[PDB]
Amino acid sequence: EVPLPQLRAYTVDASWLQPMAPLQIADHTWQIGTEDLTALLVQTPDGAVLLDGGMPQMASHLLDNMKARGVTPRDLRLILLSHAHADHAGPVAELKRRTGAKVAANAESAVLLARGGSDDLHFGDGITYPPANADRIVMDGEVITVGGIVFTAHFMAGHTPGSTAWTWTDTRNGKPVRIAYADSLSAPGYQLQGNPRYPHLIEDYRRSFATVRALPCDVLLTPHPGASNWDYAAGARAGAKALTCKAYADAAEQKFDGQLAKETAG
């Protein structure tokens, strides 16, 4: 007699769960997640913004890094997301419970967040996390202003329907730095062609490559730092090899075309 399988936890490479101290990106922007998952803290006279949180178990670590930076729980005002998968929005519910923070997201991201990533178009219930609800729904190109830092949403559907790039301008060595936090452009294990749950997947990815190519982009960051050739563990040279937005888009498109060809052959 054979039981049903046990539930399988969402396990990841150790580096994704390896805590790091805050790594400064620009004057008010810091990487505060793990070595291999981005979680960006933007500090303002008017409160802090967090872009992504990483995995569900990262909440306390994030709060510790925030504290190191002079940001108390009450100080966190806003949470923004690249996309609502467990490896990026994992600790949002907990952060909302433990801080002042409100979440802004597009409708697709909000619906996926509210189901804790369950019934994923591709993953089913394989990769889930505690559900959270959005406080504010944003539209494509909508801005959110926090202490004169303007964050702009750029939809780039594909990896998830609600995938978003967030752009803002910080400063460094006395000059403006246009930061582009571009979402994932991967399609890991996805059925790309004739997917009944996502009929226009290919078209969306193609538009998203073009969107990423054109972002205002002095510095690119990505949810998985490796995708943009960041090495958070490399200290002073963490961002030295970072791709441009143009190079990131091109690499992703070339990879996508390869995947299409292999799928046709499979």
**Shortest reach from residue 50's CB to Zn ion, in Å:** 16
Q: How far apart are CA 195 and CA 204, in angstroms?
A: 13
Of 126, 134, 130, the C-alpha closest to 115 is 130
28 as an active site residue: the answer is no
Q: How far apart are CA 121 and CA 112, in angstroms?
A: 10
Question: Based on CB atoms, which residue is closest to Zn ion, 36 or 94?
Answer: 36
- Report the interface residues with Zn ion, using CB under 5 A: 85, 87
Cβ-proximal residue to Zn ion, closest one: 85
83 as an active site residue: the answer is yes
88 as an active site residue: the answer is yes
Which of left, alpha, beta for 68 (phi over 0: left; psi -120 to 50: alpha)? Answer: alpha
Question: Based on CB atoms, which residue is closest to Zn ion, 12 or 177?
Answer: 12
The one catalytic residue in 204, 224, 231, 250 is: 224
The one catalytic residue in 75, 159, 181, 205 is: 159
What DSSP assignment string belongs to 17-67? G-B---EEEETTEEE-SBSSS--EEEEETTEEEEE--BSGGGHHHHHHHHH
154 as an active site residue: the answer is no
**Shortest reach from residue 170's CB to Zn ion, in Å:** 24
Question: Based on CB atoms, which residue is closest to Zn ion, 77 or 88?
Answer: 88
Contacts of 35 by beta carbon, 8 Å cutoff, 6+ apart = 15, 16, 18, 20, 232, 233
64 as an active site residue: the answer is no
> Do the annotations mark residue 224 as ligand-binding?
yes
**Shortest reach from residue 190's CB to Zn ion, in Å:** 11
The one catalytic residue in 28, 83, 122, 154 is: 83
The one catalytic residue in 28, 88, 122, 154 is: 88
**Shortest reach from residue 165's CB to Zn ion, in Å:** 14
Q: How many CB atoms lie within 10 A of CB 69?
A: 15
Q: Residue 117 in 3-state DSSP?
A: coil
Q: At what angle do helices 245-265 and 201-213 cross, to 10 degrees?
A: 160
85 as an active site residue: the answer is yes
Question: Based on CB atoms, which residue is closest to Zn ion, 77 or 85?
Answer: 85
> Do the annotations mark residue 183 as ligand-binding?
yes
Q: Residue 103 in 3-state DSSP?
A: strand
Question: Based on CB atoms, which residue is closest to Zn ion, 35 or 87?
Answer: 87
**Shortest reach from residue 201's CB to Zn ion, in Å:** 14
> 3-state SS of the chain: helix, strand, coil percent to 5?
30, 25, 45
The one catalytic residue in 36, 52, 75, 87 is: 87
> Do the annotations mark residue 83 as ligand-binding?
yes
Contacts of 226 by beta carbon, 8 Å cutoff, 6+ apart = 36
> Binding site for substrate: residue ranges?
183
Residues with catalytic roles: 83, 85, 87-88, 159, 190, 224
- Known binding residues for Zn(2+) are 83, 85, 87-88, 159, 224
